[PDB]
Amino acid sequence: QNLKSTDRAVQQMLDKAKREGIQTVWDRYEAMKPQCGFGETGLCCRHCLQGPCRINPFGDEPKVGICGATAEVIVARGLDRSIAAGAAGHSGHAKHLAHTLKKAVQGKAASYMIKDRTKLHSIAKRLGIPTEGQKDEDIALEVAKAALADFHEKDTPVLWVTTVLPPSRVKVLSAHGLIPAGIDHEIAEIMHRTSMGCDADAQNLLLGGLRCSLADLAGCYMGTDLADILFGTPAPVVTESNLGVLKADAVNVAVHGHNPVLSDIIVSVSKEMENEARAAGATGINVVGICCTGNEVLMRHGIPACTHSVSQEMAMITGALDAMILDYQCIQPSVATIAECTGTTVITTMEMSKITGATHVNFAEEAAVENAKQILRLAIDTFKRRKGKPVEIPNIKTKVVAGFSTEAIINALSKLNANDPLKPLIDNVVNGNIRGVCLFAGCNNVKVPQDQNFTTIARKLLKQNVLVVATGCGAGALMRHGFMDPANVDELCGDGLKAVLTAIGEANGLGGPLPPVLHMGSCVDNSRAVALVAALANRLGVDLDRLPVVASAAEAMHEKAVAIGTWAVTIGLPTHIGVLPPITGSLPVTQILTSSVKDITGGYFIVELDPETAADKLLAAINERRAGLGLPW
Amino acid sequence: QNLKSTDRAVQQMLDKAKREGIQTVWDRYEAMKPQCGFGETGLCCRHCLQGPCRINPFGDEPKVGICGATAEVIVARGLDRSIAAGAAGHSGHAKHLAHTLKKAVQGKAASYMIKDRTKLHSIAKRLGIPTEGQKDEDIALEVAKAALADFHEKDTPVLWVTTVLPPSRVKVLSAHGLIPAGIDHEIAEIMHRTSMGCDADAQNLLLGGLRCSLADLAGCYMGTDLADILFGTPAPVVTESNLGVLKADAVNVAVHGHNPVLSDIIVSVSKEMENEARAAGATGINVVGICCTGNEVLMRHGIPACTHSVSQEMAMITGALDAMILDYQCIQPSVATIAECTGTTVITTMEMSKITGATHVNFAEEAAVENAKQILRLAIDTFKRRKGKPVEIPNIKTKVVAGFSTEAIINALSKLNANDPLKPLIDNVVNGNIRGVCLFAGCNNVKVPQDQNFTTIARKLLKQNVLVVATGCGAGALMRHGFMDPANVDELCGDGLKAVLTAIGEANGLGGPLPPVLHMGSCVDNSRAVALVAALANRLGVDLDRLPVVASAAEAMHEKAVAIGTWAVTIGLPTHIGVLPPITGSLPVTQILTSSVKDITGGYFIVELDPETAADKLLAAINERRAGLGLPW
Ligand code: SF4
Ligand code: SF4
Ligand code: FES
């Protein structure tokens, strides 16, 4: 089971699933082998009813699609649709939050409120919305209206792109036609241009994809901004992760999916229902996180993370998961059938994300508290049904320090330099104590032994003094292996990085260092890394493609991760992907994405499946940036 | 070559292409056989980087996707994405026109103007925009703003759905949650809900698809409305079709693609350049149509149609096509390589639709006339390059009577009953002279011998007194085989239908009948058929699912045709599709689309690849509706 996952708790539950005959994601993967090579390489098109069309990677016919579409066109169109799909998921997430904020300040959803007034005013200022002499509710109404306006064409471009990157970066992007006109406008344009008999030039198609990736960035940044207004900006917090956070004697409730509009209320309501849970024989309600919505409540409330991504089914195999509360994205639909075996009540809540065989409880922001109590009462009932049933919770957990929003990072640094908080970080990049920065992002993928790329790459980079930040299920992988526990700084970190983490921590009164990896939040919170990198660029007077900053989607899976990787390239970063995207069937497309895009945006993809080699390539990219700034490396 | 196309002119050019070694769409199809059965049946998913996933239609594993997605989910998600892609193509088309109208009345594009003031005021009235005491330019600005507003969420639903169907139909759709909130909003929601780990319930997915299909309907109806304002509402016109409309001694210029914003200006400018063409040794500029934009200029100006859809490459094989002017959609990208063999200058004009190897001339509405002259001068240069080169134009053409907008049909009927124009049509349905109405729509498809389904089905229905209307490349197929020539009424039409066509024609002063099939225009102009059917429903006080009206996408190909077929079902029509959509791998999905959707919308798909059988099934559907109204059949 070590071929399947490097997580020991997951290995234990894989053994239980095997002896119980419960099929898992790894079993479904094995049954799919060998996978179709046309799809793997990108050389398949089903964009019209003359297909399916395929192209042999090598050899004889077929060499071209029925309509004449070349390998270049087919590969680029498929990639563009993935970017648009990722942007759409983030469109749905951010748009949800914008509607929630609007309703809240219109008096239509009293369970929600302006929790971070400071962030509200700073967003309004960034967007040009006047605040002096205005009621907070009116400022927030204007912010929500501005958010919704960025989904369509108007007399301004998407402000959640143009106001969040430095002017010089916006100028480079505008010169290449890459600034999005509206989030849903670009998604639709992608679907149009990639439909049969439309765009058929690889460079033109890929430029469209870069522009749609910025629409995805806008949705991410909008999601983070709105969630911080509504639920609070994260600050440092200490919690735990892995399956050992489940408690046999409690009602265990997992929040899984994406949006804090749902998971944040579940957290607060669960506290008010503790007595009702005790009357049912439990110690209380133990809310635990899966995937991004788990990250959201971990960052803001210290809710412990149960598991992530590929291993999500294993939480159910323990026998102790009384409910799994879902909204949308990254939920394996197998959970609905596994629940019949394990006793778990799987509950969907969003109209556009149902699963056959799961119970559906419409969640309306307007009735959030009452909907949450209905959901949690189903969980309590389920806990009662397992009275006296043995459970197998692996007694395995790590300590996790998290909550490093960009505001929190700036505040931590300000303890070393109050009025120039970014300077201590830059000073230590210059003197070599920090070699550079690497953002780990994205998913696990069943093709890769779970977490193996993230931990292998992270270990090499940390020993070379790289400051490592992480989001999403990359943060999940690193947290579940101790990379967010400051007790592991000595073992993991190079001397220079240890010195800096220690200096910052001691200045924040910790008597100890910051953790080896800084958790910057959920996948939309990749936007927080953008805010940090843009702030550094602005402080230095250079563009992002001159900074020693890289990204790694080391085990990528979802269309959202392709979108994120593409905007990382578009804003100027060397961006590693540790699984093969469906591009290898076209050398011209691969050459654009890994090489000639450098001349457009300064960023580029690094496709590398071997993690030791990927680490060397990321270090080379960092050191090339250092040399470009005239620094030793 | 009779296995390839039933069009004799196409057969002749296929022989020429063969002896010249020029590969065609039919050759590329042969090279693709056998096509992938997983894709054919819909049992393939590439929505994340764990794939490609496939499911065996029958037998052993794989039985389920890696994430747990069932065959039902995989099939429904693939279908939904096709609907969204079709809606997007129509979003791009209608949105283009909305921006053109706005610019025109803001003084930013003087080549464009309000040509149909009557239609402008009637659209404004339908939308609730006040006209009394208002300048036309201001009414048009408000109409264009309303069009653009329907792309996103607002305090009203999509008005180009809710104001174009009868209230009772809107009520049925609203009761099932099917009214779209915004055109691009629904496209994005589809891409979100079908992404990995989101919607995983076939019924829920398919309801989303029906709603997105209404977003497609809105884009179609918006496109027709705006094009009629800008370029005039069609009225009856007489022209010709097939390759014999090319003229060896003229500069032959094909307009190909979709939007009249481009093709309409080319038509007018070409007239002003006749002398400049004569100086180059030509008789003039002979503009001819391919595909929908050809239909647009045929309907409004009587421009002859050269060819359509699958046989588009054959226009170039003649050696006489000096230019092919493209905008977007349904253009085989092979045209760019064939042009090097044939001498044709292929010219793209839209930023989001380029083809490697073609010349690109940006077309800006703001400079339309100057851009058109640049394009036409490239064509003149090309004509000069072929001085003394022999050409092979098949001397094959048909006579085509067309221009039957819904306004024109109502006007024709009003000659029999001035103040109740629909009543003569209803009277003849009741007395059996008209059995029912069938709309032929959509593409040719290389899998089907070109035109064979359209003509086989049409012949049977016409002999059974069905009133036949047609759009797009269904109109193209029927026109190229004489179905729009009134001289063929005696041969093709049953006695009752002949009587009605004759009575209407004689009342319109023709001394002869209307043609056997009424050409209602381009693919967006399927919306004209909706207007006619809705007007009949309103006049009768019944919903559309009680009327003896059916549709047939007899040779469907494009994602747009899937979208159209789906909204035909959603508005209440029995809808035949003559090629297999990728649904057969899920019996539950097939059963919803062909049977249980009847209980939701009253419409349903009829999947039938044998055209004689399809005709019998369409007649049965018509006659079942007649029986439901208490009529003999
Ligand atoms: S769009 Fe072209 S390559 Fe794709 S399925 Fe249709 S004919 Fe084949
Ligand atoms: S979404 Fe599910 S079925 Fe589709 S490729 Fe990914 S794992 Fe396979
Ligand atoms: S041929 Fe396998 S993905 Fe299409």
Ligand code: FES
């Ligand atoms: S396996 Fe052939 S279409 Fe995917």
Ligand SMILES: [Fe+3]
């Ligand atoms: Fe996520």
Ligand SMILES: [Fe+3]
């Ligand atoms: Fe068309």
